[PDB]
Structures are given as C-alpha cells and as structure tokens.
Design a protein around this ligand. Structure first.
Ligand SMILES: CCCCCCCCCCCCCC(=O)OC[C@H](COP(=O)([O-])OCC[N+](C)(C)C)OC(=O)CCCCCCCCCCCCC
Ligand SMILES: CCCCCCCCCCCCCC(=O)OC[C@H](COP(=O)([O-])OCC[N+](C)(C)C)OC(=O)CCCCCCCCCCCCC
Ligand SMILES: CCCCCCCCCCCCCC(=O)OC[C@H](COP(=O)([O-])OCC[N+](C)(C)C)OC(=O)CCCCCCCCCCCCC
Ligand SMILES: CCCCCCCCCCCCCC(=O)OC[C@H](COP(=O)([O-])OCC[N+](C)(C)C)OC(=O)CCCCCCCCCCCCC
Ligand SMILES: CCCCCCCCCCCCCC(=O)OC[C@H](COP(=O)([O-])OCC[N+](C)(C)C)OC(=O)CCCCCCCCCCCCC
Ligand SMILES: C[C@@H]1CC[C@@]2(OC1)O[C@H]1C[C@H]3[C@@H]4CC=C5C[C@@H](OCCC(CO)CO)CC[C@]5(C)[C@H]4CC[C@]3(C)[C@H]1[C@@H]2C
Ligand SMILES: C[C@@H]1CC[C@@]2(OC1)O[C@H]1C[C@H]3[C@@H]4CC=C5C[C@@H](OCCC(CO)CO)CC[C@]5(C)[C@H]4CC[C@]3(C)[C@H]1[C@@H]2C
Ligand SMILES: [Ca+2]
Ligand SMILES: [Ca+2]
Ligand SMILES: [Ca+2]
Ligand SMILES: [Ca+2]
Ligand SMILES: [Ca+2]
Ligand SMILES: [Cl-]
Lengths: 347, 347, 347, 347, 347
C-alpha cells in the first residue's frame, strides 16, 4: 500500500502534478518494460521500412499500414477493458473490507470475559489468539507474502499464534480441506467453557461473543471465497488478447509513411509515435492496474500490508484484553461538568 | 471453477500473457466452434464472389457489400451486450454468495448444543445434517451437476444426508412445491426439543441458533429465487439477435472486393478478415461468457464446484460438531505472556 | 415469469440460438405490432415517393431525406434509453426481493409457539395466517392479477385468509389509508398473548418472533413504497419521446432514394430498410422490456407469479406450523457415525 | 409524487404513448419556458441573419456558424450530464428510503407496552407521538412544504405533536444545533420508565423497543445528513455551464445558412431547427429532471408527499397502538382446518 | 461543506443559473489559476506563430498543428477520467457515512445507565466522552483541520475530551500503532463496571450498549481504513498524465492557422480558443472535483465540517445523557385523545 492521502488533502494549483514524481507504486514502475518493448518493436518495423524494404515492398507496406490503421478500431478494447477494470476494482475494495479485524472481538472480550487472576488473563488472551490464528491461517492460504512468512505450520507455532498441544490437535484432525476455521470452533468451545465457569457472567454476553466471532469467521471465509472464485479466466484472456491484438495492429498501422507519396493524413514524419506511445501508456497501464489489483494479497507496492496487519492486530488485541482489562482511570468530573487553535435548508 | 489467483499475485512483465496458454476454462474452448463456423461462411461467400459470380453479379455484390459495411453500425451490439453482460456478472457473484454454508451454524452448534454422551453427539450431528440436507435439496433443484449426483431422493438417502424414517416423513408431506425448506423446520423443532431437554442451556443460545438457521434457510431460498427468476428472456433473445444479425451483416460487408475496381478503402485484398475475425472473437466471446455465467450451476469449466462444496461442507460440519466438541487443548500461557522469515495521513 | 434456466445451464455451441424459437415471454410477442406499424408507415412513405410525387417534389423529398438522415443522430436515444433501462431493471429485481415470504416466520413459529393441543395449533395457524393476510392485502393493492383474484375484501374472506369476525374488526377500523399493516399488529398482539399464556416459553423467543414479523412487514411496506413512488414520469415521457421522434426521423431519412440521382451512399435500392428495421427492433425492444418490467406485478408473461406465490406461501406455512410441529423422526445415528453417480492459491 | 404505476402494469401496444398526454409531473411543464426562450433566441438570430446583416456580414456569420457547428462537440455535455443525473437519481431513491416510518415501532409498542387502563394508553400514545414529533422536526428542517405547514414550533404544538409542557422543556434546552433528536431521547427515557414500572414486562422487549427507536432515529439523522451534504456545488455548476455553453454554441451553429452559397450539409432551409429543438428538449430535460429530483422535499409535482406521509403516519400509529391494542378477534379455526376468480430447473 | 439545498428545492425557470454566481465552493475558485496558465501558454504559442516564426517554420508548425489536432483523440481522457471520478465520488459519500455519530449511543446510555446522583451522571458523561474521544483521536489522525485544532494530545486534554489521569494511562500504553481504539476499550470496561454495580439494570441493556459501541468503533476504524488505503496511486498518476498530455496536445493542435493557406476547417481566425477553453474547463474541472473530493477531510470549501461535527456531537451527547436524563414531562393526554396552514395502483 502506497498512501498519499495527506498530499491531496486540499485541491491545490499543483494538485496532482507533484504525485507524478513518485516511483514506488507508480505507473512508470509497472509499465516501463512493456513500453520499452512496444517502442523497440515499433522502431524495428520503422527501420525495416525506412532502410531494408525495396520500393514495391514499401508500397505494399504502406497499403498494409493504411489498412491496419483504419480497421484496428474494430477491436472493442475500451469496451472490454472498462468492464474488466470496473470488476477488478470492485473486487479489490470488497477484498480489503473482508480482512478480519479483532477490534470488535477485543472490545467484547474485555467487557465480557472477567477475572484479574491468571485464569481470566488466560481466557481473554487465548480467545483473542484463536481469532488471530484463524486470520493467520486464512491469510497464509490466500496471501503470498504471509505464506513466505509462514511457509509451514511450524513457523506459525514458533510465532506464538499456535501452541504445540494445539498443533497436535490441529494436525490430528482428519480433513482434506483448509483448516482456517478450526480456531473459530476452538473459540466457541472456550467461550462456552468460560460461560459455564462463570467468567462470562450472562448468556447475553456469550451470545454477543458468538455473534462477533461469527462476523470474524465470515470475514475469513469471504477471503477464502475471493481467493477461490477468481475473476473468470475467460474475461482475463479476452482483455489480454484485446490489448495485445490492438497494439500489434498499432505497431503496423501507426508507422510513419513517406510523405512524398501524398497519402492523406501522412505528410509529417515525426519518427516517434508520441500519441501512439501515449495511447499504449494509458490502455496498457489500465490493464496493468487491473493486473496489480486482481490479487491484492501479493507483493506489489500497492498490495495490502497483510503482515503489518497481522502484527498490528495481534499486538493491539493482546494490549486490549490483557493490559487494559479493568484498568480504568477513576471516575472524574470532566471539564464541562458545570457547562480552537447549520440548522437546515428550510430555515 | 478454474482458479488462477496465485499466477497473478504480482503484476509481472509477462503478466497476463502466460494465462493465454490455458485451455480449461478458456475463451478458445468456448468459442472455437463458432469462430470456425463464421470463418467457413465467410470463405464460402468469398469463394462464391471470387470464382462463381459473373461480372454484373460481382458489381451488384460489391454494391451490397459496401451498403452492408456502412449500415451494419446501426445495430447497437455494444449497447445491448454491455448491459446484458453487466447484469449477468452481477447475478453470478450474487448467486455464489447465496450458496449456504454451515460454518456459522457449526460454530454455534458446537458452542451451544452440549453433552459428551451419545445423545449430545446425536443432537449436534442431526442439526448439522438437517442444514446439509436442505442445502442438498435446493442444490439438486438448481444445479444440473448435483441433480446428476442425486437424481432421486433414494440417492440422497443412500448418501447419508437423509435417513429412511426421515424419508417416510418427507414423502408423506402433502405439498406440490419444492420441499427444500423441510429440514429447516426439522431443525427448528429439534433445537426447541434440545432447549426443552436442557442440552441448550439458555434461551439466548436457542435464539442465536434460530437466527443462524434462518440465515442459512434464506440463502437456500435465495438460490431458489435466482433459479426461478431468470434473466428476462427478452433480453437474452435481443442480445442473441443483435450479435447474430450484426455478424451476418459483417459476413456480407467485410468481404474483400476486387482492388481493380478502385473502391475507396478497398485496395488491399488480404483474403482473411483478420480484424473482422478478431471483432467476432471479442463480441461473440463476451456473449459466450455471459452464456456460461448465466447459470453458474451447470457443468461448465468455470461453473461452481457444487458437489465439492457439498462434500466439504458435510465433512467440515461433522468434524466441527462431533470430533471437535469440548476438545480444547489445556489453557496454556502463550509465548508473549511477558511481552519474520502507518499512523495516519495528518501526522 | 418465463424460466429458461435449465436450457442455459452449459454454454453450448447452439447456446442462445434455441431460445430464439420461444414465443411466450419473447421479444417478438411484445414487438410485432409496433414493428408492423413502423414498416407500414415506411412503405407508405416509400410508395408515395416512388409513385405519387412529381419530379420536383421528389428532389425536395430527397433533400429532406438526406437532412433527416444526417441530423437524426442529434437525438440522444442511446443516452436516455440506457439510463432508463438500467433504472427499471434495478427496481425490478429489488421489487422481486421485496415480496414477503413466510419461511423465516414459519420456522420461528414452529420452533417457538408450542402445544400439540387445539389451542397451540390455533395459535400457530393464526399467526401464519395473519402474515399471509398482510401479504395478500398489499399484493392486491399493488398487483393487478391479485386484485382480479381478490376484487373485494369479501373475496379475501371467502379464500380463508380472513375470518368474518376479523372482517368486522378490519372494516370497523377508521382509516383512510391502506390497511395492509393491520394483520401485522394483530400478529404482535397475538404473539404477546401467547407469551403471556406460556405458549411462547421465553422472552427471547417473543423477541425473535417480533423481529421476523418486522422483517415481513417491512417487505410489505417496501412493496407499497415501490408501487407509490413510480419511476419519475418525466423520465418515462422523455425516453418515449426520444424513441418516437428518432424513429419518425428514421421513417423520413432511411428512405431509399433513386440511385440515378447519384447521391452519395444512395446507389443501392433494396426497397426494405433491413438495418433500420433491425435498429428499430433493438431500440424499441429495449424500451418494451423496460415497459414490461416497470410494473412487474401486472399480467405480462415475465411478470411475477404473484397468485402462485400466494398459494405456495399459504400452503407451505400451514404445512410447516401445523402438520410438521413437533413431528420429528426419532434421533437416529447417521451413516457416518463411525467415519457419486482446492486448499488455497499460495500453497 | 405523480403515480402512474397502474397505467403501465402491462406492456401494451400503445404502452408509453398514453403517458405523453399527462401534464402534471410532465417534461412539458418543467421545460416549456426554457424551450420557448431557446426558440426565441434562435429566431432572433435567424431574423438578424436573414434580414439585417449585409452580404459581407452574412459571409462572416456563415463562417462563424460553420465553426461553431463543428467545434461545439468539444463540450462533454453527455459525459458530465450522465454522471450528474446518475448521482442525483441514486441520492433521490436513497432519500426516499430515509424517511422515518413508525410501522415497526407501532408493532413493537402494541406488542410490548401493556395495559388497557388510561396509563397504558398514555404510554403507547406518547411513545408513538415522540417518534412522530422527531419525524416532524427533521422534516420541517429539510422540507419546504413541511416548513410552510409548521413555520414555528407553536404550529407543531397546535397540531398536537408536542404538548406545551414538552414545549417548555424543548425550548429550555440549551443547544445551537438542530433539536430533532430530542423526542428520541424522551422516547428512551419513557421506555425505561415503562420497563421499570412493569408496563414493559421484560428486558428483551425494552431492548427491541430501543433498537427500533434507533432505526427510526437513524433515518431522521440520515435525512439531516442528505439535507446538509448537498451534491457538490462544483458538479452542479459544471453541468449547468456545460448545458448553457453547448446550447449557446448551438444557437450559433445550428442556424440555417443560405443554400445559394453551396455550403456542404447546408442546402435545405427548414427555418425551424427541429432536431436542434429536440436535442435541447432531451438534454435540458435531463438537467431539469436532476434539478427537480436534487431536492425531493420541495414542492415540485414529483417531490415526495411529506405532509401526507406525516398525517398518514400519525393516524396509523395512533390507530395501531391505542384502538387496536389487545383487540384481537377470538381464536377461530380457519377454513382449511381440515385440509380463483415450478419446482426447479434441473427437474 | 457548501450547502445550497434550499436554493434548489423546486425546479424553477432560472433553476441552476443562480448557482453560477456563487464563489465559495465553486468551479471558478478551484480552476481559475489552471485556466489562466493554459490560456497563457496558448497565447504564447499563438504569438510565436503569428509574429516570430519564419514562413517555412510557419508551414512546418501548421503541419504539426494539423497532426496534433488529428491524433490527440487517441488519448482516452474521457475513458480514464470517468472511471476515476466515479471511484472518487463513491469513496467520498462512503467516507461521509463513516464519520462516527454518538446519537444512537446517547439514546441507549440515557435509557440504560441510571441514577440521578453524581455517580450516574459521571457514568453517562464518561461513556459519551469516551465515544467522543475515540472520534477525536481518529479524526485528528485522518483530518488536517482536526489535526491543526489538536496538534498534540495536550490539546485534546485541554479541550476536555481526555483527563490527565486518562492521559497518563493512554501514553503509558506500549503500542506503535494508532491508539484511537483505546477509549472504546475503556467504554467496554466502564459499561461492564456499571452493569456489575447495578447502574445498568439488565444484561440485555449491557449487550445493546456494547453493540452500539461496536457500531461506533467500526465507523472509526472505517475512517482509518479509508485514510490508509488511498485510491491507487497508479490511477491518480494515469488520469493526471492523461489530462496533462491531452491538453498539451491541444495547446499545439488547437492553434488558429493562417486562413490564407486554405487548410480545411481552418478559415476563421477567432484568436481565442473558446471551445478549447470550454473543453479544458470541463475536463480539468472534473479532475479538480476529484482532487477536492479525494480527501474530504482537508480544508477545501466542500470538505466536511469535521471540527463543527466534533463540537456538535460533544454538546448534544452531554445534553442528552446529563441534562435530559429522567427529565420527562408528565404523561399528558394529547390533543387527539378522543379522535394545515393514495391507496394503491390496482384500486
Ligand atoms: C507527456 C505529457 C504528460 C506528462 C507531463 C505532465 C507535467 C509534468 C510534471 C509536472 C512537474 C512535476 C511536478 C511538480 O513538482 O510540479 C509542481 C509545480 C510547482 O510546485 P507547486 O508547489 O506549485 O505544486 O506546480 C505545478 O506543477 C502546478 C502547475 C501545473 C500546471 C497546471 C495546468 C494548467 C496549464 C495547462 C498546461 C497544459 C497541460 C495541462
Ligand atoms: C491475435 C493477437 C493477439 C494474441 C497474441 C498475444 C501474445 C501471444 C502470447 C504470448 C506468449 C505466450 C505466453 C508466454 O509464455 O509468454 C511469456 C513470456 C516469457 O515468460 P515470462 O517469464 O517473461 O512471463 O513473456 C511475455 O510474454 C512478456 C512480454 C510480453 C510483451 C508485453 C507487451 C509489450 C510489447 C508490445 C507488443 C505489442 C502488443 C502488446
Ligand atoms: C436477422 C438475423 C438475426 C436472426 C437470425 C439468428 C439465427 C437464426 C436462429 C437459429 C436457428 C434456430 C435455433 C435452433 O434450433 O438452432 C440450433 C442449431 C441446431 O441445434 P443444436 O443442438 O446445435 O443447438 O444449432 C445452432 O444454431 C448452433 C450454431 C449457430 C451458429 C453460431 C454462430 C457462428 C457462425 C457465425 C454466423 C454469422 C452470425 C453469427
Ligand atoms: C416530436 C415527435 C415525438 C412525439 C410524438 C409521439 C407520438 C404522439 C403521441 C401519441 C398519441 C397520444 C397517445 C395516445 O392516446 O395514443 C394511444 C393510441 C390509441 O390508444 P391505445 O388504446 O392504442 O393505447 O395508441 C398508440 O399510440 C399505439 C401506437 C403507437 C405507435 C407505436 C410505434 C410503432 C410505429 C412507429 C412509428 C414511428 C415512431 C415510433
Ligand atoms: C460560457 C457560457 C456558459 C456560461 C453562461 C451561462 C449563463 C449566464 C449566467 C446566468 C445569469 C446569472 C444567474 C441569474 O441570476 O440569472 C437568473 C435569471 C433571473 O432570475 P430568476 O428569478 O429568473 O432566476 O433567470 C434565468 O437565468 C433563467 C433563464 C435562463 C435561460 C434558460 C435557458 C433557456 C434559453 C436557452 C439559451 C441558450 C443556452 C441555454
Ligand atoms: C507488428 C507485428 C510484428 C511484426 C510483423 O507482424 C506484426 O509486422 C508485419 C508487417 C509485415 C510486412 C508488411 C509488408 C511487406 C511488404 C511485402 O511486399 C509484397 C511484395 C510487393 C512487391 O512489389 C508487392 O507490392 C513483403 C513483406 C512485408 C515486408 C511484410 C513482412 C512481414 C511483416 C514485417 C510482419 C511481421 C511478422
Ligand atoms: C414520417 C412521418 C409521417 C409522415 C410525414 O411526417 C413524418 O412525412 C413527412 C415527409 C413529407 C414530405 C416531404 C417532401 C415533400 C416534397 C414537397 O415538395 C416541395 C415542392 C417542390 C416542388 O418543386 C420543391 O422542390 C412537397 C411535400 C412533400 C411530399 C412532403 C409531404 C408531407 C410529408 C409526407 C410529411 C408527413 C406528415
Ligand atoms: Ca497484486
Ligand atoms: Ca453455466
Ligand atoms: Ca409488467
Ligand atoms: Ca424538488
Ligand atoms: Ca479535499
Ligand atoms: Cl438479543
């Protein structure tokens, strides 16, 4: 993730111009290789036309150039690319919203799972750790960065998310499917035990805990579903073929022809297809943004900070339910007990 | 479902090019027959024009070709196809989200339906099996693959989803409508019996069970509703007619005319309508993707893995509520009891 | 509703071609009269030009034809029609989702309203009947088919949805507004009485009943709101005028002119405006689909099966809460007590 | 609101033609003045060109007309207008859904706030009146029609929504912000008092009451938010300027030039820019529909019936919670105790 | 925020014309500098062409002007700008809806946290202050205006949102991440203490309090998420480059050429590119609106009134839970105890 929200807080005279100087997360970084390849093929064709081909071959090449310039418009590149990019961006933001966060759960646990003794600390810490462990399991399933951080379950155990007895129980479970859900079942069982023990003081608190657990588990499952059900491969293939075929057609039909032949709209030889290069920049860049966003759990610059989120979530959960439990400041009268640096339209 | 999420985790230089070599779930697999038929008709017309027709017939054919090339644009193919494909894709993802999953229910059941004896196991297993049975009934109603797997209720009984006494009760029920909802009513009655027996320890736990059951049942009903209320037949007919009429018009108007006649934009005979073939590829492929996605419960490559989901859901449910019930590891102090391979914009 | 979901389960070679042979719910059925009228006016104009008008009148008519062919594009028909049709289709699916269903309520009632005696049956049956009666009242308010089935409240009483004492109470209520909500208030009062009687065993069950009742009542009210707040009349008028004016302009400007005059793009007299007829087919058909979908509660082929849904809902509700109450098969060990015809991307 | 839902229940041969004869809520009513002004300016320019200007001035005017006809397309009128109108329509339907309705609250109150004596009637009536009063306060804040009906709080008191003691408490509250929320706090306090008194029999009923109250209050607040956060003024200014500049350009460039000069596409003087008038009709009408819908709480024909809704809501609430409380017909066996005027795709 | 909702309550003859005279929040204010710069560069180029260049240089410049006028259309400015602006506007309204409001919480607290003594006042005031403090912490994290108002935590303490003992606890918490969530954990702990003390009379009231707290905390977290996950930098760069390159191309290709050369569509020298200036106005203004809306928490005219909302929320919360607690007017019979200044379609 490359944040620039502060740089654009106000609409200024040089508003988005200063963002053109950024390299990390930029279009230049994603596109300079493809732009160089396109320019190289174009200049190879141009050099062949200018220096290699004979006169009759040049006339045939000019006819082919005019033909391909005229009929390259039949490719619905904008049509297919717009549909694809809209689909990808919608999936991208939805996938970000699907990352499980322990904040609601840690608030409920701190308010509902009681006891200053070691057993209450154990209960709260273990419930939050089960939530974090489910998040880690699904994230290493769906994110290449998290997988590189946790390539084995041994790594997860060594990171403190799973104990060794829990590891024995986890691997002893007979299932051929992804086991990210197992800590959620552990959470339900442990919450039931805590309620039966009296650590959870009422059935409504247990119900609230289970509801928040199910929200968290639903987010994990939604991450799994997005990972499994890709954007349909046929759409990806079609948009890739549209871009490729259109720009090969442009490699042919955007060539500068000899102005001495008097071809219409061919009388200025600039030797560099600046507008064709710009059009490639925009269309291929749109496709590259979809390429980067289609799996936001990879290791692109603008891909989500999954490992950072894991660390933040674990630290904040443990702070909230262990250090902060029953640790309020004394009830104090505030400053305005006895009370800077629109009403409506029709009034 | 053809997953390629890992292949596109990062935006690479050969980003989507390597996906063009895939055959299963590809545009080539869905479109090669139609492309061959279009090319065959085009070449039949071209051969007739080149070898069969007389000179005056050729002149009339050339006039007709110019006319149809000019006025084929009056067909709003892009207009109708874009609307249709957007509608289909939205319905497709919504339908995937409507498939019932037992994960929330299994967590609630494991946390709320109690007893290590055989009767508690029976309660938990039977509740999860009722959920799975409702899912199977609606899926065999709406999915051709699931129907081929369960062509009769006898098959459902032999798969273990329904017992024979339950089969007698099920077929003895007098209804002319789909009975997918019956196991949900069985679930409500059994949950009430469990609460009355004391296996469910509180009324809030029963309420949570019923709420999750109603979420599951609503997903089953939404599957039924999507199956019943098709995309309006008139839209399908209109987009099919638009594509067909436009490409018959192109079969006429994209023909290569004799360059000796000096017709404008007709001076290069390439003998193969490469750009017309590409345009057919893209437009007919868009329509074929809608065709494949319109019923995502069939047996296309990218159709949903309904039978796999049935098997996974049943196995995971039975694991969660029977093997994993009250089977926690002992409460253990974690690694960070005494504590790898952004704050905000305005700060 | 004309369902064809099974016919399109798989994307086949003759995928959507076989749907072109359907008549019920088809574009041909909705559009053949308008297409005939357009063709008749076109041929009347063509006959007048070919046989009636003098030479100077023909020259003026040709100038007018060229003018209207050129400047008919100034009408933003595609612009207005696309907006209108998207709005209509979104409202259409939302309206289908707003039809009240008793399934959640019948599950809750079967699980919460208890007693095998006649009084418990009376309670459950009456609660489900109040829900069904509210649905019937709003549906006959908003659906012409349901109104034809229930043109008076006497018809509703004779159908068994309302008793005669309930009819006296209902008509004795002093209100000038639609009374569809009255059975929902009856439902709340009866649920409160059942809880006070002990038939509902706990306050959380009563709360769940009231929440599901409020979901049902909200769906009825949303049906009323969609019926009241039409698509803005000005949009309907504007799109109708756009279509009409554009196609009158085409009646003028698509006429075949005498090829002997050497007008550009006028040298082939086909005598039948096949592409203009196709364009009318597509644009007027789009408008006709919006026309049919704008009120999905009428008696069009693809309009919702409201009376079928009423009958199904009543039958299923009465089955669920009366025949199926406390009628479980004995708890039996399933087939897999001692256990046919993807893990993740980063693994 | 101008309802025509019944007129379009079925797609008929004269489907939308009969809606063109309506005047209230029509495009003609909203647009005839602007259309007359545009036509008057056009005819003033045409008269000046035809009768006033000299020959050289006519030649310069013709050159200017050709220039402005060519380059008026550079104004992205369709681009900006489509975005703006989509935004406005989405906000419009969302704003309608945000109007608070007391139906859920009246059902809950009738089912939960008990007592046939005068005190129970007082409780139920006062709770529903607090809800209605909050609705009235926010509506007179946001709706000009409701403000004209209630220009002072004295008018609200005289309408029976607020008592005089409540008026003293209301105006004695020290706040510079809109006080629409005050009756909701009164509602919470009164519900707590009723529960403490025993009129509300259980804590779950109180919780349900507070949840429905918070839904109602959230709808009131959402009305306030929509009133405050307008569609960004810069979008309104930009679309207004786009329309105005484009149609001034058309006033210049759509003028009929002397056909004797042989200007291309200028050889038929119709003296009336029928297609330009139609284009103005459609584009300016689109803008006028956005103008009417942007504040749906004004006094346009298609603006919401806010005062009617206030009256209906108050009457129905008082009927539901006072006249209908504990006023059920005796539990009676229905007609089908001993039982007119689709199963699935894969079956 | 620049509200003009009242000015557009009705669609009037001078409907949006009167909004063109506004300066604050206007397009003129956001765009006059860029428009002046574009016009200055255009006139510099025009002066060079008219007065500086030689005849052969003029001919080459004219050829370049024609080339750039023709091929500047290859830049998909409308394509990229429309996508970007739609994304920005959707994020903008979602971000407004994400601002936390204490209204639901203050209603619940006033109805559930009891006691007229000083301790009950302390409880209610402190809970509402914790909510407000969480809102302030996240807002100063995400909003530059709120940060300028609260550049240090000392400023927050001096504003009364945080006490000094709470400040010691807050800074003593060991975390490297944003601590906006800490007052929510304080809220949960204090609510648990109040329930254990008997100030909260039932477990369902505590559950409702925790649910509303979690809604509030989720809104704060969603503000953090929107601040962190910017609109992808590559989209911003691409749209900025598209606009810039297109309008530099127009600086070249919109130049008025010498009409004596007889270039087609170059025969009227107006010396001022009025239509090019208008096109720049619209396209660059669209981009500037996205620029202003992309971070709606800055200090633009139409940016949200975050500090006003902070003050309003705190004042209203303290009024609702302290001044208004258990302060009802006596239950009084209303005016209509013994009872001004549509039924359905199918009836
Ligand atoms: C292939 C072509 C496309 C790429 C070229 C795009 C421009 C090149 C990058 C800009 C310079 C780097 C950013 C920067 O560092 O530059 C900020 C500069 C001074 O810093 P600041 O504090 O003003 O911010 O200010 C500004 O760029 C503000 C003024 C910018 C001009 C606004 C447009 C109006 C004039 C129209 C000209 C024709 C095209 C639009
Ligand atoms: C009818 C025409 C359309 C169909 C033809 C499309 C292209 C043919 C398929 C590509 C080869 C198969 C995929 C593959 O196996 O090929 C991966 C290759 C090496 O493997 P890798 O490890 O680099 O990945 O790498 C790459 O293809 C990366 C470089 C690709 C070029 C990027 C475009 C920039 C140049 C512009 C040229 C004009 C059109 C865009
Ligand atoms: C005004 C013009 C528009 C209307 C005319 C549209 C076509 C006429 C209706 C088609 C026949 C009735 C449907 C049917 O009963 O026909 C199914 C047929 C055999 O039955 P089946 O078991 O194969 O299915 O199969 C098939 O139609 C499959 C092959 C269809 C061809 C696919 C397109 C590729 C070739 C391009 C030709 C140019 C236009 C696209
Ligand atoms: C500036 C130009 C635009 C404005 C002019 C639009 C037309 C004028 C208004 C129509 C008459 C008033 C409505 C009415 O009262 O008229 C209903 C009429 C008989 O009553 P009914 O019971 O049949 O309904 O029926 C019908 O209008 C049904 C037949 C209508 C024709 C359908 C189109 C097919 C023919 C194509 C002609 C070229 C343009 C589309
Ligand atoms: C670069 C060009 C674009 C910018 C120029 C746009 C117009 C200039 C601003 C208008 C005057 C300031 C607003 C105002 O204060 O002016 C309100 C005026 C009298 O006040 P009121 O009480 O009537 O409101 O009334 C009215 O402007 C109502 C009548 C307005 C005419 C409606 C259009 C129909 C005629 C078509 C003309 C061609 C273009 C559309
Ligand atoms: C861009 C993409 C990559 C490269 C490439 O694909 C697309 O670009 C294509 C363009 C082709 C050339 C077009 C024109 C001619 C003239 C012809 O002359 C006929 C005889 C003559 C004598 O009188 C009649 O007038 C000889 C062949 C030649 C040079 C083609 C060679 C192959 C080329 C380079 C193709 C190559 C594979
Ligand atoms: C399609 C919709 C329904 C029908 C209809 O509306 C639109 O279509 C319109 C077309 C009109 C005709 C256009 C051309 C001429 C030539 C003119 O000749 C001038 C003199 C001449 C002598 O030298 C100068 O050259 C005489 C009149 C005539 C025939 C029009 C008659 C009315 C018609 C049929 C209109 C009719 C009401
Ligand atoms: Ca990525
Ligand atoms: Ca399929
Ligand atoms: Ca209809
Ligand atoms: Ca209005
Ligand atoms: Ca801003
Ligand atoms: Cl609850």
């Amino acid at each position: 993730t490359v944040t620039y929200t502060a740089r654009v807080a106000n609409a200024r005279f040089g508003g988005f111009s200063q963002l053109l100087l950024l390299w990390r997360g930029s279009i230049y970084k994603l596109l300079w290789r493809e732009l160089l390849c396109f320019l190289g093929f174009y200049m190879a064709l141009s050099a062949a036309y200018r220096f290699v081909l004979t006169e009759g071959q040049k006339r045939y090449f000019e006819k082919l150039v005019i033909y391909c310039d005229q009929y390259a418009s039949l490719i619905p590149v904008s049509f297919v690319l717009g549909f694809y990019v809209t689909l990808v961006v919608n999936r991208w933001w939805s996938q970000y919203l699907c990352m499980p966060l322990p904040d609601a759960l840690m608030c409920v646990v701190a308010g509902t799972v009681h006891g200053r003794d070691d057993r209450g600390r154990l209960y709260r810490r273990t419930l939050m750790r089960y939530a974090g462990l489910s998040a880690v399991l699904i994230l290493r399933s769906v994110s290449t960065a998290v997988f590189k951080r946790f390539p084995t379950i041994d790594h997860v155990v060594e990171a403190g998310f799973m104990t060794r007895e829990e590891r024995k129980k986890f691997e002893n479970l007979n299932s051929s499917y992804n086991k990210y859900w197992v800590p959620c079942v552990w959470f339900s069982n442990l919450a039931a035990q805590a309620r039966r023990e009296g650590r959870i003081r009422d059935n409504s608190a247990l119900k609230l805990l289970l509801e928040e657990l199910n929200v968290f588990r639903g987010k994990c499952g939604m991450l799994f579903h997005y990972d499994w059900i890709s954007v349909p491969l046929v759409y990806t293939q079609v948009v890739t073929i549209a871009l490729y075929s259109y720009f090969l057609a442009c490699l042919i039909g955007r060539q500068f022809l000899d102005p001495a032949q008097g071809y219409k709209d061919h009388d200025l030889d600039l030797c560099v297809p600046i507008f064709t290069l710009l059009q490639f920049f925009f269309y291929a860049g749109w496709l590259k943004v979809a390429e980067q966003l289609i799996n936001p759990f990879g290791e692109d610059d603008d891909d989500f900070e999954t490992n950072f989120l894991i660390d933040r979530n674990f630290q904040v959960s443990m702070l909230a339910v262990d250090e902060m439990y029953d640790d309020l400041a004394v009830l104090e009268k505030d400053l305005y007990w006895d009370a800077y640096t629109f009403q409506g339209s029709t009034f």
